[PDB]
């Protein structure tokens, strides 16, 4: 077709790793019907970037990186002078990047346009203008310039309160001064390229279930490539068994044949829309051991009941032998055809069998209708407050269902009510569709629970995704983006409402779209999801606009780092580190490598540009698997005001997904403590998995490990190390930042059960901020206390101390842990829901619901708040051999 | 501007400190823009840059206009560490500005942690002798007290040693 589309097709294939021609060959009508029906999400998003073309295109490339609430915590407001911050405005005066400055003092709640108004007042002092003259120059220029953070590519393009922007509020909490500069709108708008999205060439191309009077019967035929054995089946509605599992005959592997129909204890019309068949080939010698599993939806994406013969390539069983079936696993045939197959037949009736339309569901729900405060209210309140992992007895399930009409006064109980509905029947599921049709919207953090593997009903998903379209801000969307992308695997079909919601947001926010692309590209090696995500990236790359060119320059940059680290481990592995360096400096000084690793955007933060790299600072670290320490220069004119050298660790060979999740949880826990009034400074540094055990680690500056600090000067060495780098006046600010950072990681590592901390796992900054880096494995491997707080840390917490304990400094450190512990315990449902959405990932420590139960122990969810505190006080006393008695 | 020959010019971080209403801003605006400012705009911390030739030797001047309202009693440690020279400025019509002269002297000497540092005492607002409250001899005695050069300026339309005060501080640094 169009030679411009051929050029676009080659760039899209380079970003996603596979050519677009392979998608044109997929004969699956769902794959082709997705590539066409998804293009209107691209049209609607491009139309938003063109509505008010000057400002909207700028709002897309440089979205306002702001927080969710304009209001500030009380301890944050008290860090202000009469609620006013001092900002420092810079300006270039000579064509040699010489910069002057002038400081303003303005209210925190002011529009950036008002900051520019105060800037004109300060600058026009040598102009000798009258009161009326000052109004002219303001209203002539107030609104023709934009504030920009000095150092990076962050802008202030929207009328948000200045303190709501993340950079400004981060300055407030850290006690620093904002360094901003002015830039004319026309100079920023002229640098915005025009987006040119065109519809691709492929854009141009019964009986009701409730009339079938019979039971569900599925025929198992034979099995090839199996290399005795039986087949175990089951009908699940997303982890909940709809009927009892039945087993085939016990046949030997000589001639794998069954040729038998299996009658299930389920009426055909009573099957739900999200009904699935979960089967497996099991062995038996007693010793029942699974050999291969497989799942298939009883309905296709057109609401058609399955009928006819079909082969199902099974999947290899992962590590650990659980129940013989695997409902939580993905549904669909294995792309690798070497795996054992399984031939099946589904019962044909007369013609096509469709799921009844929504209007027919309303008819049955109206008919089955014709067929409070003393404790009923409190019990419904107590049922809702329980964690999603807590069991719900059968009596409570009927009690919720009986009061399902009163449950609309507390819409947060909806997840508990959906689990109480017997999905095996159709009279109840028909009524449940009517409630969900008019159920009051819930908080977005709560609606995310309705998107894990325990809720597959499409009408239920539609309620959660609609709750996100109203309440989920772009700030929180980027916070939970890793979970929202993982639950895309739990979707029964390619075309659903969650994928259209994430795609439209990624195409109207480049900061969202950036990490959207990389999370999908990272899992592209996994053939289980390589087609669901590959088709999603194609639609994104075809409509993201100019950013695709930036992504390609990032893909080629990471590709060259992978190739180099691959040759380094195969050719010069056992060689000494000197020999490896000579090989490194040679393969990097070549022109093709220098052009690919210079002049692209940082994947850890696209606002940070990466100009020329300082090869003399690039080194192979003395850690495990030879990580690459890379150092770029900041090409910003005012780079000195933020940072001059951008340092990133490229780690090849280790799965960094566990670090991403732990760092994401640390960031979320810090935001919990901060908004309550607990100033505990955590350091959730950047970490982005970019593929199969390859990723990037953000380097924090002026930080040193305990083992490095110990060698730079035995027990009091750490205490003296801070007094040398913090004067007698800053000493109290350094030990304070040290105690508050320890209380956070002491509580965070205990709840999550991270890897054991040692002198190389713990790092300290010059100012006294402490944090961890390793994060081997979370949850389970008498609860484990990874952060033991050795006597070296106790000396710093209690300053000059005879016994460290029985000191007000230590007593105030114990209070910081108790308040932080009960703060995270009050939000237990959130973290449990964040772990639940990660089960579909390849996380070896997040496969079953038993691993998520670890935080239920460390948080003591079954005990009262008084008892849960005494619990935490015991493991600290046991791990420290005293100091936490107080009895 | 004025394009300087050679390259890598010396840069002098001259810091102007003194109480409020003394005239630190008006002196700096006069030296950089050749204009007197009569209005009341309390300064938090502003910087000014210029290339000028002093004693036939080009140099870059980074002049920092500090605060005086004492509300910003911080930030002092910053410019009192990176500053190459200091300009102690007091007002001859404000007695309170004269007592704080040695208040800034012990700060600069302690923060620098040296026996002495390039400083110049500036008696400003001498154009208002009808309300002058500090004689020339009182400024001379304070200047010889801390072994500091002395100069009387007035940022008013008559120039009066505005450029000389800065240029002398650049001279002190070159011969310190
Ligand atoms: N007559 C006269 N007025 C002067 C002179 N120098 C400064 N002033 C006046 O003194 C007032 C304050 O001057 P300013 O330069 O703001 O003083 P400052 O020492 O910078 N104060 P702050 O540190 O609070 O900004 C203004 O009214 C200004 O016009 C001078 O030489 N003569
Ligand atoms: C072993 C390693 C690659 N690693 N493995 C899993 N996580 C990490 C990891 C994560 N960070 C770091 N290491 C890190 C290291 C060094 C560093 O500064 C250097 C100068 C130092 N003090 O020697 C600053 C750092 O910043 C925190 C982020
Ligand atoms: Mg001033």
CATH number of the CATH domain containing A139 = 3.10.20.90
d(CA A312, CA A650): 40
Determine the atom of ligand 1 nearest the C-alpha atom of B89. Answer: 19
Judgement on whether residues A179 and A37 belong to the same structural domain of the protein: no
User: From the CB of residue A96, how many other CB atoms can be counted at a distance below 10 Å?
Assistant: 11
d(CA A850, CA A862): 16
SS3 A152: coil
Q: Which two tokens stand for residue A358?
A: 């929504």
Q: Is B116 annotated as a binding residue?
A: no
- DSSP letter at A441 equals P
Q: Answer yes or no: are the C-beta atoms of B97 and B91 closer than 8 Å.
A: yes
**Distance from the A77 Cα atom to the nearest Cα atom in chain B, whole angstroms:** 18
User: Residue B164 belongs to what H/E stretch?
Assistant: helix B162-175
d(CA B2, CA B5): 10
A119, closest residue in chain B (CA to CA):
B46
Helix axes A547-571 and A577-589, enclosed angle (nearest 10): 150
Say how many Å lie between the CA of residue A688 and the centre of ligand 2. Answer: 14
CATH of residue A237's domain is 2.60.40.150
Judgement on whether residues A858 and A717 belong to the same structural domain of the protein: yes
User: From the CB of residue A211, how many other CB atoms can be counted at a distance below 10 Å?
Assistant: 12
Q: Which two tokens stand for residue A322?
A: 């659980």
Q: Which two tokens stand for residue A326?
A: 């695997």
Q: Which two tokens stand for residue A487?
A: 């639950």
Say how many Å lie between the CA of residue A187 and the centre of ligand 3. Answer: 32
The verdict on B6 touching A (C-beta cutoff 8 Å) is no
- The bridge status of strand A179-184 relative to strand A762-765 is unpaired
Overall size of chain A counted in residues = 887
CB of residue A392 inside a 6 A radius of ligand 2: no
Choose the closest CB to A103 out of B45, B48, B49.
Answer: B45
Judgement on whether residues A735 and A881 belong to the same structural domain of the protein: yes
Choose the closest CB to A126 out of B1, B37, B45.
Answer: B37
- The bridge status of strand B119-124 relative to strand B150-152 is parallel
The verdict on B36 touching A (C-beta cutoff 8 Å) is no
Nearest CA to ligand 1 atom 12: B21
Judgement on whether residues A716 and A816 belong to the same structural domain of the protein: yes
Contacts 24+ apart (CB under 8 A), B43-47: B43/B67, B43/B68, B44/A86, B44/A102, B44/A103, B44/A104, B44/A105, B44/B72, B45/A88, B45/A101, B45/A102, B45/A103, B45/B72, B45/B75, B45/B79, B46/A100, B46/A101, B46/A102, B46/A103, B46/A122, B47/A100, B47/A101, B47/A102
Judgement on whether residues A263 and A135 belong to the same structural domain of the protein: no
Phi, psi (rounded to 5 degrees) for A279: -125, 170
Contact residues on chain A for B48, CB-CB shorter than 8 A: 100
Contact residues on chain A for B46, CB-CB shorter than 8 A: 100-103, 122
Judgement on whether residues A340 and A229 belong to the same structural domain of the protein: yes
Q: Answer yes or no: are the C-beta atoms of B170 and B54 closer than 8 Å.
A: yes
CB of residue A649 inside a 6 A radius of ligand 2: yes
The β-bridge partners of B60 are: B11, B51
Q: Is A705 left (phi over 0), alpha (psi -120 to 50) or beta?
A: beta
CA triple A709-A712-A716, angle to 5 deg: 65
Please report the resolution in angstroms: 2.8
d(CA A75, CA A169): 12
Residue A268 structural domain: 207-351
**Distance from the A91 Cα atom to the nearest Cα atom in chain B, whole angstroms:** 10
Q: Answer yes or no: are the C-beta atoms of A813 and A742 closer than 8 Å.
A: yes
DSSP character string of A138-150: HHHHTTSEEEEES
d(CA A12, CA A585): 32
d(CA A528, CA A332): 9
Contact residues on chain A for B72, CB-CB shorter than 8 A: 86
Contact residues on chain A for B37, CB-CB shorter than 8 A: 125-126, 128
Residues 133-152 (B) with a CB less than 8 A from some CB of A: none
Which residue, among A98, A124, A729, would best test binding to B if mutated, counting the most B CBs under 10 Å from its CB? A98
**Which technique was the structure solved with, according to the deposited record?**
X-ray
The β-bridge partners of A183 are: A146
The verdict on B37 touching A (C-beta cutoff 8 Å) is yes
Q: Answer yes or no: are the C-beta atoms of A860 and A825 closer than 8 Å.
A: yes
Which residues have a beta carbon within 5 Å of ligand 3, which is an ion? B 24-25, 43, 65
Q: Which residue from A741, A737, A767, A754 is spatially nearest to A663, judged by alpha carbons?
A: A754
Which residue among A763, A766, A771, A777 is best mutated to probe the pocket of ligand 2, counting the most ligand atoms within 8 A of its Cβ? A763
Q: Which residue from A619, A560, A618, A620 is spatially nearest to A590, judged by alpha carbons?
A: A560
Judgement on whether residues A738 and A852 belong to the same structural domain of the protein: yes
Judgement on whether residues A172 and A257 belong to the same structural domain of the protein: no
SS3 A642: coil
Judgement on whether residues A42 and A126 belong to the same structural domain of the protein: no
Q: Answer yes or no: are the C-beta atoms of A449 and A414 closer than 8 Å.
A: no
Judgement on whether residues A10 and A142 belong to the same structural domain of the protein: no
The β-bridge partners of A146 are: A183
d(CA A674, CA A74): 10
How many domains in chain A? 4
Give me the total of CB pairs closer than 8 Å, taking one residue from chain A and one from chain B.
38
User: From the CB of residue A477, how many other CB atoms can be counted at a distance below 10 Å?
Assistant: 20
In a domain, A410, yes or no: no
CB of residue A700 inside a 6 A radius of ligand 2: yes
Judgement on whether residues A779 and A827 belong to the same structural domain of the protein: yes
Q: Is A295 left (phi over 0), alpha (psi -120 to 50) or beta?
A: beta
User: From the CB of residue B76, how many other CB atoms can be counted at a distance below 10 Å?
Assistant: 17
Q: Which residue from A540, A448, A604, A763 is spatially nearest to A45, judged by alpha carbons?
A: A540
Q: Answer yes or no: are the C-beta atoms of A17 and A524 closer than 8 Å.
A: yes
- The bridge status of strand A179-184 relative to strand A145-149 is antiparallel
Task: Name the E strands within A555-664.
Answer: 600-602, 605-610, 619-620, 628-633, 645-652
In a domain, A640, yes or no: no
Choose the closest CB to B46 out of A99, A103, A105.
Answer: A103
Residue A253's Cβ-count burial label (10 Å; 0-12, 13-18, 19+) is exposed
Judgement on whether residues A18 and A160 belong to the same structural domain of the protein: no
Q: Find out if CATH 3.40.50.300 is the number for domain B11-175.
A: yes
Q: Answer yes or no: are the C-beta atoms of B120 and B133 closer than 8 Å.
A: no
In a domain, A374, yes or no: no
Any idea which ligand is nearest the CA of B162?
Answer: 1
Determine the atom of ligand 2 nearest the C-alpha atom of A623. Answer: 1
In a domain, A373, yes or no: no
SS3 A719: helix
Domain ranges of chain B: 11-175
**Distance from the B137 Cα atom to the nearest Cα atom in chain A, whole angstroms:** 34
Contact residues on chain B for A81, CB-CB shorter than 8 A: 71
CATH of residue A807's domain is 1.10.1070.11
Nearest CA to ligand 2 atom 3: A627
d(CA A400, CA A402): 5
Q: Is B139 annotated as a binding residue?
A: no
d(CA A425, CA A272): 8
- The bridge status of strand A84-92 relative to strand A179-184 is parallel
């Amino acid at each position: 077709g169009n030679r411009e589309e051929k050029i676009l097709n080659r760039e899209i294939g380079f970003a996603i790793g596979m050519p677009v021609c392979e998608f044109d060959m997929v004969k699956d009508p769902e794959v082709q019907d997705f590539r066409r029906n998804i293009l209107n999400v691209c049209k609607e998003a491009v139309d938003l970037r063109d509505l008010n073309s000057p400002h909207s295109r700028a709002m897309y490339v440089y979205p306002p990186n702001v927080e969710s609430s304009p209001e500030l915590p009380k301890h944050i407001y008290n860090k202000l002078d009469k609620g006013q911050i001092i900002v420092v405005i810079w300006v270039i005066v000579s064509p040699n990047n010489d910069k002057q400055k002038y400081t303003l003092k303005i209210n925190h709640d002011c529009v950036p346009e008002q900051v520019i108004a105060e800037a004109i007042r300060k600058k026009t002092r040598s102009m000798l203008l009258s009161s009326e003259q000052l109004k002219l120059c303001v209203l002539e220029y107030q609104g023709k310039y934009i504030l920009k953070v000095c150092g990076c590519d962050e802008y202030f393009l929207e009328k948000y309160p200045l303190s709501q922007y993340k950079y400004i509020r981060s300055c407030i909490m850290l006690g620093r001064m904002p360094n901003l500069m002015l830039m004319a709108k026309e100079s920023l708008y002229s640098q915005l390229p025009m987006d040119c999205f065109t519809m691709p060439s492929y854009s141009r191309r019964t009986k009701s279930l409730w009339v079938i009077n019979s039971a569900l019967r599925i025929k198992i035929l034979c099995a090839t490539y199996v290399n005795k054995i039986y087949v175990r089946t089951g009908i699940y509605h997303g982890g909940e068994p709809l009927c009892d599992n039945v087993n085939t005959q016990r046949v030997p592997c000589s001639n794998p044949r069954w040729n038998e129909w299996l009658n299930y204890d389920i009426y055909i019309p009573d099957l739900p829309r999200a009904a699935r068949l979960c089967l497996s080939i099991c062995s038996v010698k007693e010793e029942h051991c699974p050999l291969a599993w497989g799942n298939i939806n009883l309905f296709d994406y057109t609401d058609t009941l399955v009928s006819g013969k079909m082969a199902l390539n099974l999947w290899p069983v992962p590590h650990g032998l659980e129940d013989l079936l695997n409902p939580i696993g993905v549904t669909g045939s294995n792309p690798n055809k070497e795996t054992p197959c399984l031939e099946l037949e589904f019962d044909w009736f007369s013609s096509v069998v469709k799921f009844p339309d929504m209007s027919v569901i309303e008819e049955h729900a109206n008919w089955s209708v014709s067929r409070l405060r003393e404790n009923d209210k409190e019990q419904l309140k107590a049922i809702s407050t329980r964690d999603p992992l807590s069991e719900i007895t059968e009596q409570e399930k009927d009690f919720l269902w009986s009061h399902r009409h009163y449950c609309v006064t507390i819409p947060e109980i909806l997840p508990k009510l959906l689990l109480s509905v017997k999905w095996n029947s159709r009279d109840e599921v028909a009524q449940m569709y009517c409630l969900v049709k008019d159920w009051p919207p819930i908080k977005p953090e709560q609606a995310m629970e309705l998107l894990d593997c325990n809720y597959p009903d499409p009408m239920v998903r539609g309620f959660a995704v609609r709750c996100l379209e109203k309440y989920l801000t772009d700030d929180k969307l980027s916070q939970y983006l890793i979970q929202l992308v993982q639950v895309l695997k739990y979707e029964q079909y390619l075309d659903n409402l969650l994928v259209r919601f994430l795609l439209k947001k990624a195409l109207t926010n480049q900061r969202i779209g950036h990490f959207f692309f990389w999370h999908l590209k990272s899992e592209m090696h996994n053939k289980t999801v390589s087609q669901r995500f590959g088709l999603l990236l194609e639609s994104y790359c075809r409509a993201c606009g100019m950013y695709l060119k930036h992504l390609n320059r990032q893909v080629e940059a990471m590709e060259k780092l992978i190739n180099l680290t691959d040759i380094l481990k195969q050719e010069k592995k056992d060689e000494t580190q000197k020999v490896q360096m000579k090989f490194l400096v040679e393969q990097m000084r070549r022109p093709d490598f220098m052009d690919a690793l210079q002049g692209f955007l940082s994947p850890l933060n696209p606002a940070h540009q990466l100009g020329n790299l300082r090869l003399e600072e690039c080194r192979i670290m003395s850690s495990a698997k030879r990580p690459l320490w890379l150092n770029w220069e900041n090409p910003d004119i005012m780079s000195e005001l933020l940072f001059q050298n951008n340092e990133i660790i490229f780690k090849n060979g280790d799965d960094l997904r566990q670090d991403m999740l732990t760092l994401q949880i640390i960031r979320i826990m810090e935001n919990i403590w901060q908004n309550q009034g607990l100033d505990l400074r955590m350091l959730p540094y950047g970490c982005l998995s970019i593929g199969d055990c390859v990723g990037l680690i953000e380097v924090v500056r002026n930080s040193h490990t305990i083992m490095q600090i110990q060698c730079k000067g035995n027990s009091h060495t750490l205490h003296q190390w801070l007094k040398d780098k913090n004067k007698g006046e800053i000493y109290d600010a350094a030990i304070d930042l040290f105690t508050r950072s320890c209380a956070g990681y002491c509580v965070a590592t205990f709840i999550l059960g991270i890897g054991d901390r040692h002198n190389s796992n713990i790092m300290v900054k010059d100012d006294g901020q402490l944090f961890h880096i390793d994060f081997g494995h979370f949850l389970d491997h008498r609860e484990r206390v990874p952060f033991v707080l050795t006597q070296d840390f106790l000396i710093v917490i209690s300053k000059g101390a005879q016994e460290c304990t029985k000191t007000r400094e230590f007593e105030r450190f114990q209070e910081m842990c108790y308040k932080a512990y009960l703060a995270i315990r009050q939000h237990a449902n959130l973290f449990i829901n964040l772990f639940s959405m990660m089960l579909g990932s390849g996380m070896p420590e997040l496969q079953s619901f038993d691993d998520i139960a670890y935080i239920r122990k460390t948080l003591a969810l079954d005990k009262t708040e008084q008892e849960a505190l005494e619990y935490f006080m015991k493991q600290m006393n046991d791990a420290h051999h005293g100091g936490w008695t107080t009895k | 501007t004025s394009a300087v020959p050679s390259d890598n010019l010396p840069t002098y971080k001259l810091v102007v400190v003194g109480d409020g209403g003394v005239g630190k801003s008006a002196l700096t605006i006069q030296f950089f823009a050749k204009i007197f400012v009569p209005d009341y705009d309390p300064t938090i911390e502003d910087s000014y840059l210029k290339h000028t030739e002093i004693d036939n030797q080009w140099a870059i001047l980074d002049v920092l206009d500090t605060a005086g309202q004492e509300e910003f009693s911080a930030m002092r440690e910053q410019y009192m560490r990176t500053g190459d020279g200091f300009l102690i400025v007091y007002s001859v019509t404000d007695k309170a500005s004269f007592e704080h002269v040695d208040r800034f002297h012990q700060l600069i000497l302690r923060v620098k942690d040296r026996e002495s540092f390039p400083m110049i005492l500036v008696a400003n607002k001498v154009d208002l002798m009808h309300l002058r409250k500090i004689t020339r001899e009182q400024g001379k005695e304070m200047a010889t007290k801390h072994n500091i050069p002395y100069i009387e300026t007035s940022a008013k339309d008559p120039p009066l040693n505005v450029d000389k005060a800065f240029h002398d501080l650049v001279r002190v640094i070159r011969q310190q």
